[PDB]
């Protein structure tokens, strides 16, 4: 982690200063820290999965808008060709 020099740390204004049962229960407390580690990792893997398809999605959406953007241009060439 970043370590701010104490000379920089000292001369800062007020707002932003860096601030620097056993037995069964242990098996039933280590267990709770066990499961919450599972859910966070599972969510983080599902969440990052979603962003991957999002990048794919915005890309496949981007090739349709350009086709939609371009084809409209010719329609306004033939339309105003009459006018």
């Amino acid at each position: 982690g970043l370590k701010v020099p104490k000379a920089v740390q000292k001369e800062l204004p007020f707002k932003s200063q860096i601030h620097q049962l056993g037995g069964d229960e242990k098996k039933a407390r280590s267990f709770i820290q066990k499961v919450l580690t599972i859910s966070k990792a599972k969510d983080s893997k599902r969440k990052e999965q979603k962003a991957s398809q999002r990048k794919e999605r915005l890309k496949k959406l981007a090739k349709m808008e350009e086709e939609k953007s371009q084809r409209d241009k010719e329609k306004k060439k033939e339309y105003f060709a009459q006018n």
Binding site: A28, T37, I38, A41
Partner: protein, 37 residues
């Protein structure tokens, strides 16, 4: 359930099952191999 199986908390009923605890011990050990890497 058998009266012995009923417990005063879900965690006790959950911690009673053997299949679930084995699965977490295996899976939790896997994550540290990724997290402590």
């Amino acid at each position: 359930m058998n009266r012995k199986e009923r417990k005063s908390t879900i965690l006790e009923t959950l911690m009673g099952d053997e299949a679930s605890n084995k699965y977490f011990k295996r899976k939790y050990n896997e994550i540290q191999e990724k997290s402590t890497s």
